[PDB]
Amino acid sequence: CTDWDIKKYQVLVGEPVRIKCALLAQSAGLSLMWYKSSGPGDFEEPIAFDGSRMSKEEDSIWFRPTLLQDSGLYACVIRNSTYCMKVSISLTVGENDTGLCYNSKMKYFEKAELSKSKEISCRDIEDFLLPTPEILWYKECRTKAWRPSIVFKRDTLLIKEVKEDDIGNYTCELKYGGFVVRRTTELTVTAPLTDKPPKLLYPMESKLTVQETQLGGSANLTCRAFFGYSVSPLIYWMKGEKFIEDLDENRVWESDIRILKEHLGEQEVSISLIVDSVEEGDLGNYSCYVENGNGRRHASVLLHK
Amino acid sequence: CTDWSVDIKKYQVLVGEPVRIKCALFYGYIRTNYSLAQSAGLSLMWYKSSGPGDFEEPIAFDGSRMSKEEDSIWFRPTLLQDSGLYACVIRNSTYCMKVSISLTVGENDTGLCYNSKMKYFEKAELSKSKEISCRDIEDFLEILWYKECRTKAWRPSIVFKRDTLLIKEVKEDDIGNYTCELKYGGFVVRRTTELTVTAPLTDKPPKLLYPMESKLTVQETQLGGSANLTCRAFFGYSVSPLIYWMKGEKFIEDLDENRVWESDIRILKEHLGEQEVSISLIVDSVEEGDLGNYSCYVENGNGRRHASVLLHK
Ligand SMILES: *[C@@H]1O[C@H](CO)[C@@H](O[C@@H]2O[C@H](CO)[C@@H](O[C@@H]3O[C@H](CO[C@H]4O[C@H](CO)[C@@H](O)[C@H](O)[C@@H]4O)[C@@H](O)[C@H](O[C@H]4O[C@H](CO)[C@@H](O)[C@H](O)[C@@H]4O)[C@@H]3O)[C@H](O)[C@H]2NC(C)=O)[C@H](O)[C@H]1NC(C)=O
Ligand SMILES: *[C@@H]1O[C@H](CO)[C@@H](O[C@@H]2O[C@H](CO)[C@@H](O[C@@H]3O[C@H](CO[C@H]4O[C@H](CO)[C@@H](O)[C@H](O)[C@@H]4O)[C@@H](O)[C@H](O[C@H]4O[C@H](CO)[C@@H](O)[C@H](O)[C@@H]4O)[C@@H]3O)[C@H](O)[C@H]2NC(C)=O)[C@H](O)[C@H]1NC(C)=O
Ligand SMILES: *[C@@H]1O[C@H](CO)[C@@H](O[C@@H]2O[C@H](CO)[C@@H](O[C@@H]3O[C@H](CO[C@H]4O[C@H](CO)[C@@H](O)[C@H](O)[C@@H]4O)[C@@H](O)[C@H](O[C@H]4O[C@H](CO)[C@@H](O)[C@H](O)[C@@H]4O)[C@@H]3O)[C@H](O)[C@H]2NC(C)=O)[C@H](O)[C@H]1NC(C)=O
Ligand SMILES: *[C@@H]1O[C@H](CO)[C@@H](O[C@@H]2O[C@H](CO)[C@@H](O[C@@H]3O[C@H](CO)[C@@H](O)[C@H](O[C@H]4O[C@H](CO)[C@@H](O)[C@H](O)[C@@H]4O)[C@@H]3O)[C@H](O)[C@H]2NC(C)=O)[C@H](O)[C@H]1NC(C)=O
Ligand SMILES: *[C@@H]1O[C@H](CO)[C@@H](O[C@@H]2O[C@H](CO)[C@@H](O[C@@H]3O[C@H](CO)[C@@H](O)[C@H](O)[C@@H]3O)[C@H](O)[C@H]2NC(C)=O)[C@H](O)[C@H]1NC(C)=O
Ligand SMILES: *[C@@H]1O[C@H](CO)[C@@H](O[C@@H]2O[C@H](CO)[C@@H](O[C@@H]3O[C@H](CO)[C@@H](O)[C@H](O)[C@@H]3O)[C@H](O)[C@H]2NC(C)=O)[C@H](O)[C@H]1NC(C)=O
Ligand SMILES: *[C@@H]1O[C@H](CO)[C@@H](O)[C@H](O)[C@H]1NC(C)=O
């Protein structure tokens, strides 16, 4: 039968899951089958349904609860006299690690700006909603008394003003017929957006630094700048109108950008310009260009002797 | 900059073994090499996010273990921390591209040499040859093979050739996890594969068990009653089993009463790829028209067999 899934399932052992065949079928005479492979290339064993945990319900399989055994590839096949279709679903079951409520490999991630609003939502909770709903939030796998600044509405968490204290793993809990559904997200805070172009440190914008090199010598011109949080940092060297790529590719080349420091999204990167076997043409005024969202700044270096 | 969400290539390694993460942009996406691209002034940076939504911190290498060598990153050895998403970015005045590579690091579980989630899989036919190879090994260029995480003396049926394991005749006993080991400068490289043996190709069409091919079984039902007609067959290894009910020329879908429907296929047994499935035909509020001869059709690659059932009373 025709063969091809992007949808992947991650769940903690002891939590209810619903796996759907990605593709009225009973009416058309179509017969539906599932296979568990547990790996790419495996036997794809036919599943004989029990009634306690694994339930064949409509277009889906229900696990109540899930077990470590359940981890694997699930292939849903539809069969007819002349018609067939099948698709494979990946289910990974893991256990919360050592006293924690969640699994390290299995969690969501978010980023927030200091002194700014941020919303945290309980994602992928649709399959347990009826009739048309209670949720509890944990901080570092512990119950907390939440400040009035933080507001809870309908499966979501809102922080009106975000502080450097509000960092870590946020896990929401749902009750599903004597079962718990946990979705955990980790928040990382960064400094707010710059609103200002980066700052040149070496060379400075208005000092006109001087570099001395002898002919047939080696020249190292190293720019340095500070990039506040705002894409990779854009810092590069130019000699007048000519870009680094244009001038004499055999003797002169540009180094890769280095990260001298990083904190809260702010970086202090440095890049260097290297010239070998320096000649009369190489001597002149070199400028380090630094650019971002709000501006383009540059400073100059003089090559002498 | 222009983005390629996630690279198909993913890395799975045991903690304490060497890994090499390759920037996909130089090998697959773009033909131009790192040595010639950098000449054009392109700058390369890496980021470690550990998640699709995380901060993506810029990594300052500065390490004995983590080495920025050309278009790749070297881990010698790898650590449990290293698990995450690695994004390589190329920078220009007006040009940018980035791609993300997934590295997953795990530890051998409870007295075992391997990780259950991280291993290869294979299938073999009984009494036939099958070769097991040490896959995706390179950048570390002799091999030694273990069976069930133990050193073994191998029969002349099993032969060793560089980077491969060959079994002339596969037997039902030689099933399980085969792990090859390589030594790379005081480090060990383990690649483990699991073998599952199945019965050889049928060469014969399936066999009807219930009803039998030439007995013409009879079921008695009263009018306004309930009818359960359950077929049963044996399918040897050869895809889902093709077994279905028919009433004369008409398929089950054709008569399409709200009263008569077909059940889903059930798996009564499984051994070595051989199945003995059963399907049932159900009729509710039986009427005079429903009475007649029903046939259960069973089919596979080499043949089509069928048996008949008579509905009476
Ligand atoms: C028309 O009539 C047919 C009868 O031919 C009905 O089909 C039967 O439906 C019943 C449903 O109750 C089936 O009963 C099931 O038996 C399965 C087989 O047993 C397992 O155990 C042995 C070991 O002894 C294994 O070797 C074997 O491979 C099986 O795995 C069970 O798996 C079923 O589920 C569970 O049952 C008990 C319930 O407490 C659990 O404790 C068990 O752990 C088990 O998981 C179930 O018991 C019966 O097999 C069917 N027969 C056939 C021939 O298909 C149709 O349903 C009916 N049509 C209707 C009503 O529309
Ligand atoms: C939920 O959110 C919390 C924070 O809100 C996260 O906490 C971090 O958890 C990780 C583990 O996943 C911690 O990493 C581990 O802890 C060690 C502590 O680091 C400090 O160590 C000493 C004090 O003991 C300090 O002096 C030092 O400056 C460090 O700040 C790490 O150092 C460990 O790595 C070390 O060990 C390995 C092997 O032993 C070595 O090879 C390494 O080189 C390294 O030395 C270890 O990885 C991390 O520290 C926690 N952060 C904080 C701030 O406490 C949770 O991770 C998060 N939940 C999940 C699932 O991620
Ligand atoms: C190649 O490598 C793979 C993977 O490493 C091996 O697959 C293993 O196969 C063995 C079979 O010999 C499996 O062993 C079995 O473990 C099961 C554990 O389940 C228990 O726990 C769950 C909850 O987590 C319960 O639901 C369940 O009822 C069990 O309690 C059990 O089915 C068996 O363990 C025995 O221990 C329990 C106590 O826990 C006893 O009460 C029972 O009597 C029971 O017999 C069974 O032994 C093992 O789990 C498989 N591993 C994985 C990861 O799937 C291959 O075997 C290996 N190849 C070769 C040739 O060895
Ligand atoms: C051109 O000039 C630039 C700037 O002057 C220069 O950049 C320098 O690069 C080197 C490495 O390529 C840096 O040296 C390292 O700095 C970091 C600390 O941030 C550490 O990794 C190292 O510290 C120790 O390293 C050794 C152990 O690995 C120790 O033995 C050693 O004693 C150190 O303690 C190492 O110092 C250097 O920091 C920068 N320069 C600046 C100012 O940051 C570049 O290399 C020059 N040449 C080119 C581009 O060809
Ligand atoms: C996070 O993971 C840990 C371990 O991975 C989970 O701990 C487990 O907790 C259950 C219930 O408390 C334990 O089962 C019970 O064990 C006691 C032992 O006396 C027994 O009397 C009970 O009848 C029941 O069987 C289980 O042993 C324990 N697992 C361990 C210790 O390895 C924990 O539940 C997970 N979730 C969290 C912390 O939210
Ligand atoms: C980074 O630098 C600039 C900014 O966009 C780009 O410059 C030019 O890009 C073109 C197409 O990518 C390059 O094509 C070449 O054209 C020459 C023409 O003589 C031809 O001989 C080559 O075979 C090739 O087709 C061109 O070299 C390049 N010019 C430069 C770098 O000076 C560049 O493409 C950007 N991106 C990179 C380098 O990946
Ligand atoms: C399992 O990993 C440990 C390191 O945590 C190592 O010492 C041990 O040798 C490994 N097992 C085998 C069979 O090599």
Author numbering:
A (entry chain B): 31 to 34, 37 to 55, 66 to 174, 177 to 274, 277 to 351
B (entry chain A): 31 to 171, 178 to 274, 277 to 351
Share the article's original sentences.
Vertebrate type-IIa RPTPs comprise LAR, PTPσ and PTPδ, which share common domain architecture with a single transmembrane (TM) helix flanked by a large extracellular domain (ECD) and cytoplasmic tandem PTP domains: the membrane-proximal PTP domain (D1) is catalytically active, whereas the membrane-distal PTP domain (D2) is inactive. In mammals, presynaptic type-IIa RPTPs form trans-synaptic adhesion by specifically binding to their cognate postsynaptic organizers through their ECDs for inducing synaptic differentiation of neurons. To date, five different types of postsynaptic organizers for type-IIa RPTPs have been reported: interleukin-1 receptor (IL-1R) accessory protein (IL-1RAcP)7, IL-1RAcP-like-1 (IL1RAPL1)8, neurotrophin receptor tyrosine kinase C (TrkC), netrin-G ligand-3 (NGL-3)1011 and Slit- and Trk-like (Slitrk) family proteins. To elucidate the structural basis for decoding the ‘splice-insert signaling code' in the type-IIa RPTPs, we determined the crystal structures of PTPδ-ECD in complex with IL-1RAcP-ECD and IL1RAPL1-ECD.
